[PDB]
């Protein structure tokens, strides 16, 4: 009746000859061996507790992972894994001397929004490295149940402990460093606890005494290390953001992404031929109609598909004709065929029609707007996004435009008496709606005057309806685009001054700026006379 | 090991290696009395049908494609002059255009007939789908699988019958959109 035990039993008793299993487990292991003796082999339960005591042995229960840092030496491996991200080297840095009079790990819990391609999970991978500290990462966009978090019921045969306690087992850990993809992608189901079951992740007071379903016990992981990544901040609930250390990253310059290419992504994608790093002919020229052809895209992610192609082609070429340095003439015969043509295909705008800037998910946009004439009464036809906010912002813009002719140009009366149709593309954000509220405007204005804009001018602001600019959001991305579309100057609200001088270098020079409080002042700057 | 026998014809992009191997994972972990476990099954099975990378063979000349044209169908000088423009293009690059190509005239002419014939021309898999008087964009991007008998893109469905990855389709009466 004990013969059963020599099989399995034996491997369990082994691998806790050094864990030090926590109180709750002192009595649950007693329980389970006691079992596992006397059960017979074809018990129901006998194969539950041979899985679930192959489990508990397996967790690293009381087995301490030597956290070791040093303020200076953690600083330098950032910078040798990964160009820009200044201020999140800061960030981290400071968390780094916190953790050293804590004289242990701190439980900070950071998330980085923002466009992709900017290598939100490759920071973690450096960061980790720099701490000597193990990493795993969740997938929270495919994230449904709380059963593949928290595990299914003991009770039930062929259950298995949730993600959580698979990465405990797996990675050896007592200190780890987790990773959570897309907080904002939150999945749906018949259990939507698990968007507020990342609530009780965020708490420290919560990870601790973190139930699990299949191993019968709370599991205590306190001050605990974990980094979150997302898109825009809307889209994450409001619960989690709200305690949440909400951190941005930035998008990439031209100049700033051909360095990026050069010294980090082109050695990783050389390891992919594994083919010799020196006399690499993959120069700058080269890189330069990739950034113009493929590189639309704020971040890295269709320069990385390119580049991680451009030498998988290499590989096969070892042993696939005489390659002869394979790797500007010839770019076209080695990736296949230009895509991209050039943004401002009418930069010879027609009156009535002016860009602006935008956000978007993927990054920051320019976006055109159209006025056009349908042709008492008088009316504005809106198409395009359909949302009422976009509606409303329109109608301001519609009024606030007719206030200003009838004082400039009392005399005209082309708005006051016409239908005009407007269309606006689809790629904004809700608060992105206010903000393209001053380029209506001008598009009225422009469309009423006759007159297209001086050349080459971008704008973004919404506007009052006596005419006062107010504040937008993203900043930040939306001047990438405009460096990126080659714009000549941009005028911002004077409440948004304190954004642009903060930003990175590159972008700065070679752009004329004017702050605005009111539109008479834009009205001057996009018409000379 | 049935989906593993169909991704070895139909292997999907780089990228849908973590997606596929996820979901039968999670398979194994979902009992098969599971109302999941179903519906897992069908999105497996519908991800594998569909010829990723896997496209039949095109075998064109455009002096063949006249004979074609002249043996389906009398007449339409203009018609097969305008076509065979088109063709002429596709081969110079032999690709598909950026730009698309639709036919307006009476109901009765034929206009679903070229399509059938350029096909036949071609030596190519038609597959048609009308858009004739819908209003629900759901109808072309389908339903998420928690909706009860869940159905997908009419796109994705006739990628998957026809069993390649450039398949000849029509989109009629665009027009009554
Ligand atoms: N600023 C950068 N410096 C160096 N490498 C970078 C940079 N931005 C992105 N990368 C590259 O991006 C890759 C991973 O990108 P990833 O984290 O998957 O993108 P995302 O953050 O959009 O998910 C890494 O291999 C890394 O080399
Ligand atoms: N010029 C033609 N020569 C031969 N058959 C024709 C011709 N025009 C139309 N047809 C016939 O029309 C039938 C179907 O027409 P169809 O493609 O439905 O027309 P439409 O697209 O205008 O509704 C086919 O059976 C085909 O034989």
Redesign the interface.
Known sequence: EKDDKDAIEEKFRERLKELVVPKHVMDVVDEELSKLGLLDNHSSEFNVTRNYLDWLTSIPWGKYSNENLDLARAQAVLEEDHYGMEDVKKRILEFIAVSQLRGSTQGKILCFYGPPGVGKTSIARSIARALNREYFRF?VG?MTDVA?IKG?RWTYV?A?PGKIIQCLKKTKTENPLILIDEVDMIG??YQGDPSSALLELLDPEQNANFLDHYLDVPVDLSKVLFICTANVTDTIPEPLRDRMEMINVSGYVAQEKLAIAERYLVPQARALCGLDESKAKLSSDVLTLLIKQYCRESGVRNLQKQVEKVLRKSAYKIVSGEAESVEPENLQDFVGKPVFTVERMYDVTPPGVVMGLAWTAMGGSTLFVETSLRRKDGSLEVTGQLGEVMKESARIAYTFARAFLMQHAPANDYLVTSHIHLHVPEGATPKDGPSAGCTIVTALLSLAMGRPVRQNLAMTGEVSLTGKILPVGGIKEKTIAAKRAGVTCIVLPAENKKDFYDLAAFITEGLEVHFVEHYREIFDIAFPD
Do not use: A, I, T
């Open positions: 997938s495919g593949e299914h062929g298995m749906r189901g």
